[PDB]
């Protein structure tokens, strides 16, 4: 296309020091900064599969980051969750009262983990089978951008706006995946919720940073 | 101004014990919340803004 | 040496008065800046020399 994010004049991941990007990264796909130093996308089929994997990971991680942030914020403000922290919310089902959505005893009130696992397995199996092979909500649609019933508001009719929104989606998804990797590492190292880590850093930025835990995993 | 108050001599602290005098500000309040609370504080009585 | 300091300070005052009276005249007079560069340079250099000398004398008093 003819836009700032496509073609040979697109921005690249090393600024002026990037040089010439790899030949197969011609710049016809969203979020193409020409960063394939490892050379894992030489084969176009592998490139397509990696693009699909990246997009699915991006959407899942956007959802995951939002769902990790929101309950802890609400619990900090005062909502009585069973376990507000993202990496502890799974253990609520072992509590005597069971899992309670929003802390209310009349919302969901789940008791058995086996039923949750079984229903999730069935529903998600059907969902992903429909995603791979066309189902009730469209049959002959694109694998990554089905549109149709999944774009009710008609935000992707204009091809130029469609490309712009694709770039925005991929960029926000990459940011979300980076932040989710940060979530995992901070949970492993610090042991507190991400909002707790942010509050601690804001309280004393000079000392409450990552280096404070640097001497945590040293062997003895 | 910060260097003058911190290293080269000091500033006249009027809240020092007894009558105020020249003092060096060894620990300025750099906390973001405390610093930015003044700006968003109300200007009416009791609060007084900055 | 207060007498020397006071004499130098009075000389500085006189030189500064002469400079502030003359520089606008030299600037605004057509074809005057070209033929009076030396006088203005000497006056400014003398002003700087006198103020520095007064400072040194004050350090000695």
């Amino acid at each position: 296309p003819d836009s700032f994010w496509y073609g040979p004049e697109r921005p690249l991941f090393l600024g002026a020091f990037t040089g010439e990007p790899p030949s197969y990264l011609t710049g016809e796909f969203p979020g193409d900064y020409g960063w394939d130093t490892a050379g894992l996308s030489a084969d176009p089929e592998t490139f397509k599969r990696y693009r699909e994997l990246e997009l699915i990971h991006a959407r899942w991680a956007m959802l995951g980051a939002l769902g990790c942030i929101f309950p802890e914020l609400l619990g900090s403000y005062g909502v009585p969750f069973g376990e507000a922290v993202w990496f502890k919310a799974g253990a609520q089902i072992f509590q005597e009262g069971g899992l309670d959505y929003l802390g209310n005893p009349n919302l969901v009130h789940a008791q058995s983990i086996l039923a949750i696992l079984g229903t999730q397995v069935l529903l998600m199996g059907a969902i992903e089978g429909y995603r791979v092979n066309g189902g009730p909500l469209g049959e002959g649609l694109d694998k990554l951008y089905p549109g149709g019933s999944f774009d009710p508001l008609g935000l992707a009719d204009d091809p130029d706006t469609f490309a712009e929104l694709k770039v925005k989606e991929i960029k926000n998804g990459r940011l979300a995946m980076f932040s989710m990797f940060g979530f995992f590492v901070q949970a492993i190292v610090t042991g507190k919720g991400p909002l707790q880590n942010l509050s601690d850093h804001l309280a004393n930025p000079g000392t409450n940073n990552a280096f404070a835990y640097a001497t945590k995993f040293t062997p003895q | 101004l910060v260097w003058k108050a911190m290293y080269f001599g000091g500033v006249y602290d009027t809240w020092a014990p007894g009558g105020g005098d020249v003092r060096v500000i060894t620990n300025p309040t750099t906390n973001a919340a405390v610093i930015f609370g003044y700006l968003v504080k109300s200007p009416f009585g009791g609060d007084g803004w900055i | 040496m207060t007498s020397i300091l006071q004499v130098a300070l009075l000389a500085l005052i006189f030189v500064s008065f002469a400079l502030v009276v003359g520089v606008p005249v030299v600037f605004a007079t057509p074809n005057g800046w070209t033929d009076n560069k030396g006088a203005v340079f000497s006056g400014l250099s003398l002003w700087l020399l006198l103020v520095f000398v007064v400072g040194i004398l004050n350090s000695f008093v």
Binding site: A16 | F8 | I56, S59
Partner: protein, 250 residues
């Protein structure tokens, strides 16, 4: 020799019209110094030419070159001297046992039978066991040989400076004050305009070093301490410790 800029983009000598040619920088601004009064022998050829010559010490181009030789030699010696005056004092004042300390006291440290400690920054500090007379003899012999080589224009073949290209035989044809070749192991002077820019930088840094060494001498004579001590004390107490305070302390 194709290079790029330090911060990206094209690399080279940028613009050389600021230091060469009729258009250039001068020791006074445009409004105070018109281009007509520039002396005729002060044309945009030599590096670092600001059209500065009150009292007309220079008369014509060959005398200008004769004085340029002395200016460049003095500049390089003053750069070396400024480095060797500043660094050892700062090293000693921070913990190292240099035993020489301030420059104006290092000479007397080697009087009588005394010796001098030499610090190899990265690596240890050694206690150089040479006596004073051996130092004098070695210095005079080596400096005489080197200056005789410089004056004659020819010297021995193939010494060991870590040079990029070995087995130097003849020095004939090398420009005095810029021999290059054997004296340019890294090959940074191959590009001509880059060489001109480097010449300008060299002469400017050298003039700064010359003025700084004169300041070293004068303020060390006045205050009685080394330049590093004066710098640190002035930074610690700007208004308390300066020239005006030092003068007439009693």
């Amino acid at each position: 020799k194709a290079t790029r800029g330090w911060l990206g983009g094209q690399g080279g000598a940028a613009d050389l019209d600021k230091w060469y040619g009729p258009d250039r920088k001068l020791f006074l601004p445009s409004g105070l110094y018109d281009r007509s009064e520039i002396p005729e022998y002060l044309n945009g050829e030599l590096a670092g030419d600001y059209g500065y010559d009150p009292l007309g010490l220079g008369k014509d181009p060959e005398t200008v070159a004769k004085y340029r030789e002395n200016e460049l030699l003095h500049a390089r010696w003053a750069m070396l001297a400024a480095a060797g005056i500043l660094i050892p004092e700062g090293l000693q004042a921070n913990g190292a046992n240099i035993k020489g300390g301030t420059w104006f006291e290092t000479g007397a440290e080697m009087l009588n039978g005394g010796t001098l400690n030499y610090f190899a920054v990265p690596w240890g500090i050694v206690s150089n066991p040479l006596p004073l007379f051996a130092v004098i003899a070695v210095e005079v012999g080596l400096m005489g040989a080197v200056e005789f080589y410089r004056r004659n224009g020819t010297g021995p073949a193939g010494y060991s400076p870590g040079i990029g290209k070995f087995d130097s035989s003849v020095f004939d044809g090398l420009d005095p004050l810029y021999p290059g070749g054997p004296f340019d192991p890294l090959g940074l002077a191959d590009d001509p305009e880059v060489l001109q820019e480097l010449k300008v930088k060299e002469i400017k840094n050298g003039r700064l070093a010359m003025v700084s060494v004169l300041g070293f001498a004068v303020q060390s004579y006045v205050t009685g301490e080394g330049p590093y001590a004066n710098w640190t004390k002035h930074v610690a107490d700007p208004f308390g410790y300066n020239l005006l305070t030092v003068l007439g302390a009693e």
